[PDB]
């Protein structure tokens, strides 16, 4: 789980933080696309 926020780029999001800062405790999904 991370937080892609402005004023910075990205950092790890912990549950208590998300609870307080009203963010979603979600993680990034990446897929390898072939061509």
Partner 1 sequence: ATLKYICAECSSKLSLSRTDAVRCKDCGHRILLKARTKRLVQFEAR
- The residues of the shown chain that bind partner 1, judged by CB under 8 A, are 7-8, 17, 20-21
Name which of 21 and 26 has its Cβ closer to partner 1. 21
- The answer to whether 11 touches 2, Cβ cutoff 8 Å, is yes
26's tokens: 């979600």
Question: Helix, strand or coil for residue 12?
Answer: strand
Shortest Cβ distance from residue 8 to partner 1 (Å)? 7
Shortest Cβ distance from residue 22 to partner 1 (Å)? 12
Shortest Cβ distance from residue 27 to partner 1 (Å)? 19
């Amino acid at each position: 789980p991370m937080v892609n926020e402005s004023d910075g780029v990205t950092h790890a999001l912990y549950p208590q933080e998300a609870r307080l800062r009203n963010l979603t405790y979600s993680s990034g999904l990446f897929v390898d696309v072939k061509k």
